[PDB]
Structure formats: structure tokens, C-alpha cells
Ligand binder design. Structure first.
Ligand SMILES: *[C@H]1O[C@H](CO)[C@H](O)[C@H](O)[C@H]1F
Ligand SMILES: *[C@H]1O[C@H](CO)[C@H](O)[C@H](O)[C@H]1F
Ligand SMILES: [Mg+2]
Ligand SMILES: [Mg+2]
Ligand SMILES: [Mg+2]
Ligand SMILES: [Mg+2]
Ligand code: NA
Ligand code: NA
Ligand code: NA
Ligand code: NA
Ligand code: NA
Lengths: 1011, 204, 193
């Protein structure tokens, strides 16, 4: 029997699902949540052996250990141990579409564990084993005897071993199959791995036991009063003296309690549940749970004799909160949420899909520290501890079924098929039964990218039926189907309609007001953070803030799915699709996070932090108006820091305590500001600082900022009179300019400044030349394969237009001598195949002061695709340690992604000026720069620039950051103009029109000089 | 057209139908009936089964049908006759004028039933007028009510033909047998004969 | 595998359900509803033998007729031929309530049919067998070969025998279980056959 090829069979002998248990035999321990003697981890070293197929597994293995087996850690993904390659496929199934069949060649991991059990366990009650995560299906044997089977890689599979075990030494044998019929339901956009990847354990329950419990909180009109209802079920002989006591604690204070014998109310003609009972506990002025104030209580469920003897106790944390959609708004505790979310897979660059607390905690804190308040379990129920952490630190969670059939044709091929309803239902039901008591979980989701089938409808109703406390959403088939309480599209744009057939993605603002539509809209995915991305992020926020029913969304996504590999000399590097011989593959498309796999942030994180700020500011004269977007807490750990500077030079500064009630306002008037008579721009910057530490942040933490330009005093003063007057020396091939120790040289054949010297030091390795292209961003590439070309992608368009290959054609080059200067005038034509793409016209004006002033005017053919940038570039001979500038920063910032950055005086190590995106592209840009200083060089004007040891060409030819090599000297890219980077999606052009270089005529000017 | 699902003997009645583990088996009993009979014009209403209390399985299956075949109303009497798994108030044995206020699953008078606050559905009895033996007394009363109230749209009498079986005596003569006649026990004796006609189709 | 005690298994290898087909190869006949050559009845005389439990059934049966069997009409209810007794219970299940388990003593009707098929059937196309109603669960074998399993006493259970059939003489062996996990969903107020 090939059960792994029968969606009709998803388990055998498996126990029913339930909420997390520990069988504590001491109430006190349960209360304190101390560890339970009844719950043992079998995590650690296990025996493992790999086979190409299950038929290759040796019968002996069941009775005895294979000498050839190795000793490995569990949990783990075998690919992480090197047994076989991890595969990175997106939509396309990693195996042949032939449901419910799987390949004959099906990697099989045979696991085994030798262990002991004490008689105690054995002499009375129940001994069961729990496999938190097994990928994708598996058979289990104990002491040579087969126990059962299980499917669904993302939920615990449980079996009773009571009758398999013997005092002392026991042996587990787990035959784990890489693929199965459950795989047709596990087509998520991630690495395809396998193994015993989540905890293994053993739990002891008494014969008379708590088999299930449901915790509910209902409130009065103003939440000033609550009723906690606890439904408790038992297994065991039914007896009159049996009782249940449910007690509620706030810290060490017991706030409520109730006890009762089993026997629920009459429910139908045949009676009620004699094995159940419901406790109702009244709670006055309960402390409510939210992500802003994760207040929790402890619920302790005791199963005991009337007369006092405790049989066992189970327990959980409880968050009193109400989730509800009313009049088109998702409310929490009666207030409308504004979701600052992120999608997050369970990914680890070293361990793969194994999740540890450390990592979890870390993810949580960065998210909180970055203004996120919610997370989506893309696209499967997560490791148990995750929910507990969310409960405690405070995050809103979308709990999602492990059901993704994206590779099908059409997408709802299985979900619309009744024959698959059973396997699907279990993916939904068991999730619910497991996580229904976590307050963090506020919405249930039916899975992902599985089209829309009758099955979804059934399942949707099932949930609503069993747990009315939470809304249910699902994006499949159009995002606004009958199977979802929220309009939850992926990648719908703010203002821009994408009217695909059957499943259009309307402008989010238009979507809300479609006739008959009334639901709230929360994007299940938006702002694809792939590489140099997140352009247009603020646009979403502004809309979320203006329209009440736009209650936010979940960014796609949290961390890059990169895996660490090693080179010939044991140095580690970041790998993506195909880097393991895996094919077909989807290359870098598994890398779309705000942070790198090691959790180091991408520059975009900051953009996200800013836009998601919880405090809003307006300036009027010297009064700042602070508005609070907190729904529940007052600004009780916040201070306002302000500062005024003139061109980077600090004039004044102060700090003000924030005292803003949620949704409230606070006006802050600044002291008269000092008056400088000195020319330039005064800038005001404000930062909200958290004086004290929290469980998720260090004291001094900065949570919000904003900047404004105050007065400006135009410099009317005249530069100082120059003693010298530079000299020009002509030759047929060049024009040379000389002033003191400085000289410039311009090639007459090419029309460029080809050399500059300080003293006798040349300053350039490559001539200063115009630049209209960039090493393409992932967003510029979109899908566009080389086997498969997408003609509408930017890169493709640029490529086809010859942008990357046009050659400069000199139209003119001349020299004039001024009163106080030499003037070089040039003109070039950029053509491709007889087409004039661009025209550049310049003048170089060097005066007796040694300042070279470059004025540039370009023309762009209206019928050529809008160029990536309009600037100049050159390779400097020099390599300096720092880069100092007067403009936006300090981090990388692009035109459509620069709100977070601040204008000021920045000074970093050269290296911070490069963004080590794993898939290399244009990066490190800084906008709104008025002054840039490198080594003895200094540039002035109003531009954007980048500077690194890497040319655009290298960047463009290398696909892995580890393969980059510093070139001689430093490449400088100075732009008068730079195209937006986009990112509404990473597979169609996404740069908004306002950020495209379509004006046709461009002008800029810079002053190059020394210091 | 009614799904093959009846869990009458459970305690409480919805013990299985409300358990997700039984959703799969149950699902097939409905889905498969629909796939088979859906082109039949005579079938005008789908039933989720009989006497299985009211469980979440019912709701999901209810929805599966609505979704798959919107051409026909779906009914189910279990758990009260007016739950969320039924488009028609379809009680068994509710009386005309007399209320029988059973706990949890009362059988209101049908006329009163229709007008309960917020109730708007049509009401058609899945079973009424138990024709067991010398019976059918008060039949007219239903008819008068069905005729006067628009939303009282009729019902299905219980039931058509006596479930008696032929047995032969020593002298090989036949005779109608019922519960217990075959050594069968426990048994419900004459309870299997509630028809308007005898087993051989001769009318009562 | 005691598939009849696992509500997780309600069939094995069963084809998908669908409306009544006849596979006509002529439009006029389909229109007029005439009988169709592609659809053939196996009702008639079959061979039968009664056992008290699935375990009492001998393997011989799979390969060959059981001398002890009788020739009976099909379709039929074995309680009507005297093999065992019909049961009349209303609410209380006819078996002990302990889902998904059934009694160890569980009456088994071993049915069999020797028959032939047109060669052309063998040649090309698909040949499936359709059982309109089997109470309550059954295992099916063709020419010794195990074909599949089915539950739900009131809907047709269909199997492809394209691969099991053979030139001329074929033998079907149907092992039918009185009780099954299906019985828990079949508690209707009527005779239990
Ligand atoms: C939304 O799309 C992103 C694109 O990278 C991933 O494929 C997610 O799984 C999908 F739900
Ligand atoms: C309605 O009750 C009658 C009583 O004879 C029958 O038992 C039916 O099966 C039930 F639906
Ligand atoms: Mg299977
Ligand atoms: Mg997908
Ligand atoms: Mg079964
Ligand atoms: Mg009944
Ligand atoms: Na909003
Ligand atoms: Na992706
Ligand atoms: Na590249
Ligand atoms: Na009427
Ligand atoms: Na009856």
C-alpha cells in the first residue's frame, strides 16, 4: 500500500488534534508555566540513513540500526546535512504533475532513535509521541512494530505508544518520504526540503484526562466587563466525583474561578455531552490584549476529584480581546486596526526550515523595532512557540492552513474537487483545533494561491461555524470571493488598475467602492521587497491613512530565503535557486525580504519603519502637531527630540516629553530660533525617543522621525576674486588647462575630460563620461529569462533600444578663453543602429579659482524608452576611507524610496556606500545631495550619486555578490537624474510615471573642485 | 434527494456530525449524491440527511452544495429544524396549533414558528401525520393551515408503505411480520409499519 | 487492513461519481433512449456463500468457486434468502456503539460471478464495473486480482477493470461486510439488511 500516493489516506492511527498540552500534575507548576515532568523532548542525536526510494529500505532497519546510518541532529532538514539537494522552485511543482502520483525516485530518510522509558510511565496512563513537523509524509514503527502514518508537514502528528513501549530501552524507526500526495498541497514559493524538522517529544497523560479545551472571551459594550467561557472535554471513565476547575490569574493574583462536574447542557433530542462541561467566569474591568499592550492572564484548567485530588492540569495564556468586522471595518477591542504587517516564512540560512527560539525572538524584535504590528504565517501553520511569542511580545497574527496548489492548471484544479476535500479539510481543521486559544491569532486563512474552489467555501463555513471569534480570509480566485471576510489582494496598486481577466487587481482605492462591496481591504501581500526595492511604499501608507476601509497590509516579505554555501577555501556565501544543481529553478526569486538571511537589514527596512510610524507630525510656524495613531496606549515611554541645523551645522536643539492619548493630539511650540545671517537652508528634525527599555527594545530606541525645511536665506554674496587665470594649451588631440599645481585634459577626438592631475598625480583611471543606464535591479528585470524574454520589462526595453550599447558621437568640441577662465564646450550624439537616443551638450568652465563648473543639458528621444538615469560617471584613481556628504542619508535612498532619509551631513566608511544585495545591481544611491567630498575631491550641486569599488558593468555581469571584486580606484556615478526603483511587484514594470525620466529635456550642473 | 447519513443512535445526536474527523466520510455521502442526481429535473431540493443532530459538518456541507449547485434549496431538519444548515424550516411532527417546547429543540406550532422574531423562511414539514396503524386523525387540520398561511407550504407525510415482511407458517402460509419476528432483538416491534398502504400496496 | 473499521477509508481505487451514463456510439439511440450496447447488466444468477466474519473466508474463494456456495439471484439482500436475520431497530444502533469499531462476528456475503466479455472490449477503451448498491462495504477482486473497496450502501461504487479482464472467462469475487464504519452513518429507522 502506497499511502503516500493516496489523498484518501492522510494518516493512520493518528490521534486527534488539540491545543498545546503538558499534563502537569501540579497546579502551581501549570500556573507558573514551569516545565512539566510529563513532557520530554526527544530532540538531539538520532540515527539517519538516506535512500533513493522506500523500496530501498532494508527490513532490518526496523529491528535494528544500520551500521551505515550516521549520527545526526534532530530536528533537521536532510538537505541541510548534504544528503540531497534543496530545490528552489516557485510555481512549478518540483515533481511531475500527475496527482496523486509522485516520482518512483523518492528520497527517503530513515530515522531512528534509541531511547529509554521509565516503568512509571508505563505502569499507568498514556504515553504518546508527538512529531511537531515531518516533511512530507511518514510511517512510524516502535520496537519493530509499525505504529502509523502521517501527512501535512506543518502540524504535529501524534501517536499512542502506550502499548508499544517497554521499560528501559526502546527504538523508534521513522521512514520519511520526500514526496507524497500531501505535496500537491505544498506548492509554496520556497525551498523544497525534507525531514524531521520540528521537535519530537513524548507526553504522558493519565487515563482520565483533559483531551480538549476552548477558551473564549466576550465583552460588554464598552469592554468594561467580560465573560470568560471555557469548554472542557475529557477522555476517561465518566464519574460523578469528577470536576473541572478553571481559574484565572493576573500575575500572582487569582482573579476568578469556577468549578463544575462534567455534563454539558442538552443540545438535541438525544441529550448533551456527558464528557464535557463549560465554565463561565466573570471578569470586571479586564486588562485587554493588543499588540500595543500585550496584557495576558493565565488560565489553569484542573481536572480533579470533587473532593480535591488533582488528576492533571493543562493551561494557557489568555488575551482578552474582541476581533470583529463591523460596518466594513476590522475592529480590535472596538477600534479599527491599521495593519503594519509582514509575511514571514520559517527560514534559516544554516538550518533551513528548522526554527529556534533565538531566531524567532530576534525576528520579533526587529519587526517591533521597525514598527510592524502584525505578521502572516506564509503559508502554513508555524512552529508552536511562535504563537506564544506573539502572544507575549504582542503581534497580530494571521494563522494559515498548509494548502498551496499554485502549480495546477487552472489553479483551482484540486480545490474545486470534492475528492480533495478531505485532505484539505484536515489542513484547516487541525490548525484551528490547535491554535484557537492564542490571543495573537486574530484571523484564519484558508491557505494560499490555490485558486478558488467549492472546497474553500465549505471550509470557510466550517471555521465560521466553529469559531466565530475570528474573521476568515483567503486571497485565491480574485481576493474578494465568497470564501473571504476581507478583500485581501496580493500586489493591487494604489491608484493603478490591473484588469486581468477573471482575477483583476483593481486600484485598492477603487476596489473598496465597487457596487455592492462593503468589506475592509488588507493586502495579503504588497510591496515586493526583492532586492533594491520598496519604491512607492509611502504611497501605500498615505492611502492606508486616508481611507478608513484600507486597513493596511502585509509586506512580501520578511527575510531573504538564501542558503549559506562554501567555496573551495571554506568561505561561506549566499546561495539561491540552482546553486545546488537544483533544476528547474527560479534563481533569486526566493530572495524578497526586508532583511538578509542573517537578519542584517536591507536599506528598505528603514523606509518601512518610517512609513509605519505610530506618530504623525505637522508643522505650523514653530508649532509641531503630533498625532498618535495608537488605539490603546498613551505615549508613556516617549520623548520628542528636536533639532535645527543650517546646512548640517547644528544651531539649536531641545527635547520634549510626549503626552499624547491614543488617537490624540499634542501641540509643541518651539522657542524663538536663533537667527543666523549666514546663507543656506535651515532644517528642522524631530525624533521620538523611548527613554526606557521594553521587552522589545533598548532605552533610547528611536520609534519615529520627521523633517522639515524652515527658513532659507539665498546667498547673494559674490565669490572671492581670483588671482590666477588658468592656461590653455592646445594640440591637435587635446586641450589642456593649467592652474597652479592643477591641470585638466580634454580629448578632442572623444570630447571628454580624460585626465586630471593634482600636482603630478593623475586623478582618473577612466574619463568622465555621460551615463544613461544602470546595472538592472531585480525590479528592472522582472521575470525576463534569457531562454524566456519579457519584452515589456524595463531591462528588455532598454536592451532592445540599444541603451546599453549606444556609442558616443562627438558633434563638437571647443575651447574659449575668458577673462577669468577657459571654457570647453562639447556636444555628443548617442546612437544605436542609426537612431539618435540621446544628445548631451556641455560646457566646462574652469576659472582662476580652480573650480571646474560642469553644466549639462540632455535631450532624450521621446520614442526611446525612458532611461534609467541621466548623469556622468568616471573611475577615480583614488581610494579613500570615507565619504562625506551634505544630502539625504545616511542609507541608500532612491527617488521613490527616500522619505525615511534625512537631509544632513553624513560621513561613513566607503563600504557603507555599497549595498551587498545577493543578486548584484545598481545600489548605494543617495539622493538630494548638495555636496559630496571624497579624498581631496569635492563635488557640488544638486544631484544623486553612488560610489564604490564596483562598476555598473561588473555589477551587471556578476550574479552573486560573493563573486564581486574591487576594481582599482573608485567608481563614481553622479546623476542629475535617476529613475524610481519600483517594486509594487517584481514581475511587471512597477515604476510610477512620476518617477520615470520622461521629460525629454534635462538639465543639471555640478561644481568639481578640490580641498 | 437525501444524503445517506443518519446518526440517530449517537449521544448526543450530533456526536459524529460535529467532529471533523467524520467530515470526510460525510462529505462523500453528500458530494457523490449531488454529482449523480444533479441533472434530474424532478429533484428540486437537496437534503443533508436525517436525524444526526446539528454539527459543523452540516454547515460546511450545506455551503458546499450552495456553492456547487445554486439551482436548488438545501434543507436539513437536524438540531432544531431551523438551523443555519437549512433554507427551509423543516420540522418533523410539529403540530398545527400546539407548541411542544422541548429543551434545545422545541417543536413550535407551525403557525407560530413562521413568525418567531427575525424568522423569514418557508416551512415544509419533513415528516408529519404519522400513519402508524389506525391514524391520520387531525390530518385536515394541517391542510386548513397549509391553505391559509402562505409560508406554510405543505409537508411529507410519514410515511408511504408499511415496512412489514412476509413470513410463512408451518403450513407454508404467509403473513406480515414486523420487528422481533426474526429472532431479531433488540427490536422496535411494530414501529417499522407507519405507512398509508400495506406492504403489498393495498391501502389503509 | 481492517478498512471497514476506519472512517478514513471509505473507498480505495473507486472511480469518480457522475451522472448516469450509457456510452452510446450512436446519436439516435442516445436521443431516443434506446438500449446501449456499451452498457451491460450482470444481474442474474451469481454464486453465494455466507460467513460469520471476514476471517472465515478462505483464500480458495479468490481463485475459485466454492462448491459449498449456492446459486442465488442478484440483486438481492441475503437476509431475504435466509442466510441470516433481518433486524428491526429504530434509534438504538444494531451494533455496540464504539466507533469506529464493528463487531468481530460480522456477517460476510461472499459473492461471485463467472462471465465473459467481448474481445473488442479488451482491445481498446475502458471497461468499468458498476455496483448500484452494496450494503454496507465491500472488497472487490477480478480473476484473483484485488481491484478495490467501497462504502456508502446507497450510491454506485465504480472500478476500472480494463486491466484485470481477460480473454473469455473472468471471475469476480465480491466480499461484502454487513457492518462497517459506514454503519455509524446508516442508522435509519428501518430493517437492517
Ligand atoms: C505572493 O507572491 C510572493 C512573490 O514572491 C510569493 O510567491 C508568495 O508565496 C505569494 F503568496
Ligand atoms: C422521522 O421519524 C419517523 C418515526 O417513525 C421515522 O423513524 C423516520 O425515519 C424519521 F425521520
Ligand atoms: Mg496519502
Ligand atoms: Mg505560490
Ligand atoms: Mg472505512
Ligand atoms: Mg431515525
Ligand atoms: Na485606513
Ligand atoms: Na518569491
Ligand atoms: Na547582476
Ligand atoms: Na400555504
Ligand atoms: Na418508524
Amino acid at each position: 500500500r502506497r499511502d503516500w500516493e493516496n489523498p484518501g489516506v492522510t494518516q493512520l492511527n493518528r490521534l486527534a488534534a488539540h491545543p498545546p498540552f503538558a499534563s502537569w500534575r501540579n497546579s502551581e507548576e501549570a500556573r507558573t508555566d514551569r516545565p512539566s515532568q510529563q513532557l520530554r523532548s526527544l530532540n538531539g542525536e538520532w540515527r539517519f540513513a538516506w535512500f533513493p526510494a522506500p523500496e530501498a529500505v532494508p527490513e532490518s532497519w526496523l529491528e535494528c540500526d544500520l551500521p551505515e546510518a550516521d549520527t545526526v541532529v534532530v530536528p533537521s532538514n536532510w538537505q541541510m546535512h548534504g544528503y540531497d539537494a534543496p530545490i528552489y522552485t516557485n510555481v512549478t511543482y518540483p515533481i511531475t504533475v500527475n496527482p496523486p502520483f509522485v516520482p518512483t525516485e523518492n528520497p527517503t530518510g530513515c530515522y531512528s532513535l534509541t531511547f529509554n522509558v521509565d516503568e512509571s510511565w508505563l505502569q499507568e496512563g498514556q504515553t504518546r509521541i508527538i512529531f511537531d513537523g515531518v516533511n512530507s509524509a511518514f510511517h512510524l514503527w516502535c520496537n519493530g512494530r509499525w505504529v502509523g502514518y502521517g501527512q501535512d508537514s506543518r502540524l504535529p502528528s501524534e501517536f499512542d505508544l502506550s502499548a508499544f513501549l517497554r521499560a528501559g530501552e526502546n527504538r523508534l524507526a521513522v521512514m520519511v518520504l520526500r514526496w507524497s500526495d500531501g505535496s500537491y498541497l505544498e506548492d509554496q514559493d520556497m525551498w523544497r526540503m525534507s525531514g524531521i524538522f520540528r521537535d519530537v517529544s513524548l507526553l504522558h497523560k493519565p487515563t482520565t484526562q483533559i483531551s480538549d479545551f476552548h477558551v473564549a472571551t466576550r465583552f460588554n459594550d464598552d469592554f468594561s466587563r467580560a465573560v470568560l467561557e471555557a469548554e472542557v472535554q475529557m477522555c476517561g471513565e465518566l464519574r460523578d466525583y469528577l470536576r473541572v476547575t478553571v481559574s484565572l490569574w493576573q500575575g500572582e493574583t487569582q482573579v476568578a474561578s469556577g468549578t463544575a462536574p462534567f455534563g454539558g447542557e442538552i443540545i438535541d433530542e438525544r441529550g448533551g455531552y456527558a464528557d464535557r462541561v463549560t465554565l463561565r467566569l466573570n471578569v470586571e474591568n479586564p486588562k485587554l490584549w493588543s499588540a500595543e499592550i500585550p496584557n495576558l492572564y493565565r488560565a489553569v484548567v484542573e481536572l480533579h476529584t470533587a473532593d480535591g485530588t488533582l488528576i492533571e492540569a493543562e493551561a494557557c495564556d489568555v488575551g482578552f480581546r474582541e476581533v470583529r468586522i463591523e460596518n466594513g471595518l476590522l475592529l480590535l477591542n472596538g477600534k479599527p486596526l491599521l495593519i503594519r504587517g509582514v509575511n514571514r516564512h520559517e527560514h534559516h540560512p544554516l538550518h533551513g526550515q528548522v526554527m529556534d527560539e533565538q531566531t524567532m525572538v530576534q525576528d520579533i524584535l526587529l519587526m517591533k523595532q521597525n514598527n510592524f504590528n502584525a505578521v502572516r504565517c506564509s503559508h502554513y501553520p508555524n512552529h508552536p512557540l511562535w504563537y506564544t511569542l506573539c502572544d507575549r511580545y504582542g503581534l497580530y497574527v494571521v494563522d494559515e492552513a498548509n494548502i498551496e496548489t499554485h502549480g495546477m492548471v487552472p489553479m483551482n484544479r484540486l480545490t474545486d474537487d470534492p475528492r480533495w476535500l478531505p485532505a484539505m479539510s484536515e489542513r484547516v481543521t487541525r490548525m484551528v483545533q490547535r491554535d484557537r486559544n492564542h490571543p495573537s491569532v486574530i484571523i484564519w486563512s484558508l491557505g494560499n494561491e490555490s485558486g478558488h474552489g467549492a472546497n474553500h467555501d465549505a471550509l470557510y463555513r466550517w471555521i465560521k461555524s466553529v469559531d466565530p471569534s475570528r474573521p476568515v480570509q483567503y486571497e485565491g480566485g480574485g481576493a474578494d470571493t465568497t470564501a473571504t471576510d476581507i478583500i485581501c489582494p496580493m500586489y493591487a496598486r494604489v491608484d493603478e488598475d490591473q484588469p486581468f481577466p477573471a482575477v483583476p487587481k483593481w486600484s485598492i482605492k477603487k476596489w473598496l467602492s465597487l457596487p455592492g462591496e462593503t468589506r475592509p481591504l488588507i493586502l495579503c501581500e504588497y510591496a515586493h521587497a526583492m532586492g533594491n526595492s520598496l519604491g512607492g511604499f509611502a504611497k501605500y501608507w498615505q492611502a492606508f491613512r486616508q481611507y478608513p476601509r484600507l486597513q493596511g497590509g502585509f509586506v512580501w516579505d520578511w527575510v531573504d530565503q538564501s542558503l549559506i554555501k562554501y567555496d573551495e577555501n571554506g568561505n561561506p556565501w549566499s546561495a539561491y535557486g540552482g546553486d545546488f544543481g537544483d533544476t528547474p529553478n527560479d534563481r533569486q526569486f526566493c530572495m524578497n525580504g526586508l532583511v538578509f538571511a542573517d537578519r542584517t537589514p536591507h536599506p528598505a527596512l528603514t523606509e518601512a519603519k518610517h512609513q509605519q510610524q505610530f506618530f504623525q507630525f505637522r508643522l505650523s510656524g514653530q508649532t509641531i502637531e503630533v498625532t498618535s495613531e495608537y488605539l490603546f496606549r498613551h505615549s508613556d515611554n516617549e520623548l520628542l527630540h528636536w533639532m535645527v541645523a543650517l546646512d548640517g551645522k547644528p544651531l539649536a536643539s531641545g527635547e520634549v516629553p510626549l503626552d499624547v492619548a491614543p488617537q490624540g493630539k499634542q501641540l509643541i511650540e518651539l522657542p524663538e530660533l536663533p537667527q543666523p545671517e549666514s546663507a543656506g537652508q535651515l532644517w528642522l528634525t524631530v525624533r521620538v525617543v523611548q527613554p526606557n527599555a521594553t521587552a522589545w527594545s533598548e532605552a533610547g530606541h528611536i520609534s519615529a522621525w520627521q523633517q522639515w525645511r524652515l527658513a532659507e536665506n539665498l546667498s547673494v554674496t559674490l565669490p572671492a576674486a581670483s588671482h590666477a587665470i588658468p592656461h590653455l594649451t592646445t594640440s591637435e588631440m587635446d586641450f589642456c588647462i593649467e592652474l597652479g599645481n592643477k591641470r585638466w585634459q580634454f580629448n578632442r577626438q572623444s570630447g571628454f575630460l580624460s585626465q586630471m592631475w593634482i600636482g603630478d598625480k593623475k586623478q582618473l583611471l577612466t574619463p568622465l563620461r555621460d551615463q544613461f543606464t544602470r546595472a538592472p535591479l531585480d525590479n528592472d528585470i522582472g521575470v525576463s529569462e534569457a531562454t524566456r524574454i519579457d519584452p515589456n520589462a524595463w531591462v528588455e526595453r532598454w536592451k532592445a533600444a540599444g541603451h546599453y550599447q549606444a556609442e558616443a558621437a562627438l558633434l563638437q568640441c571647443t575651447a574659449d578663453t575668458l577673462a577669468d577662465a577657459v571654457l570647453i564646450t562639447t556636444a555628443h550624439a548617442w546612437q544605436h543602429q542609426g537612431k539618435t537616443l540621446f544628445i548631451s551638450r556641455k560646457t566646462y568652465r574652469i576659472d582662476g579659482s580652480g573650480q571646474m563648473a560642469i553644466t549639462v543639458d540632455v535631450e532624450v528621444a521621446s520614442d526611446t524608452p525612458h532611461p534609467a538615469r541621466i548623469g556622468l560617471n568616471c573611475q577615480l584613481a583614488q581610494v579613500a576611507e570615507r565619504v562625506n556628504w551634505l544630502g539625504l542619508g545616511p542609507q541608500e535612498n532612491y527617488p521613490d524610496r527616500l522619505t525615511a532619509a534625512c537631509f544632513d551631513r553624513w560621513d561613513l566608511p566607503l563600504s557603507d556606500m555599497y549595498t551587498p544585495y545577493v543578486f548584484p545591481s545598481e545600489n548605494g544611491l543617495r539622493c538630494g545631495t548638495r555636496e559630496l567630498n571624497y579624498g581631496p575631491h569635492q563635488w557640488r550641486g544638486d544631484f544623486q550619486f553612488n560610489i564604490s569599488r564596483y562598476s555598473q558593468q561588473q555589477l551587471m555581469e556578476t550574479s552573486h555578490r560573493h563573486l564581486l571584486h574591487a576594481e582599482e580606484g573608485t567608481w563614481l556615478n553622479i546623476d542629475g537624474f535617476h529613475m524610481g526603483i519600483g517594486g509594487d511587484d517584481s514581475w511587471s514594470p512597477s515604476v510610477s510615471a512620476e518617477f520615470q525620466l520622461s521629460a525629454g529635456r534635462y538639465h543639471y550642473q555640478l561644481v568639481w573642485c578640490q580641498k
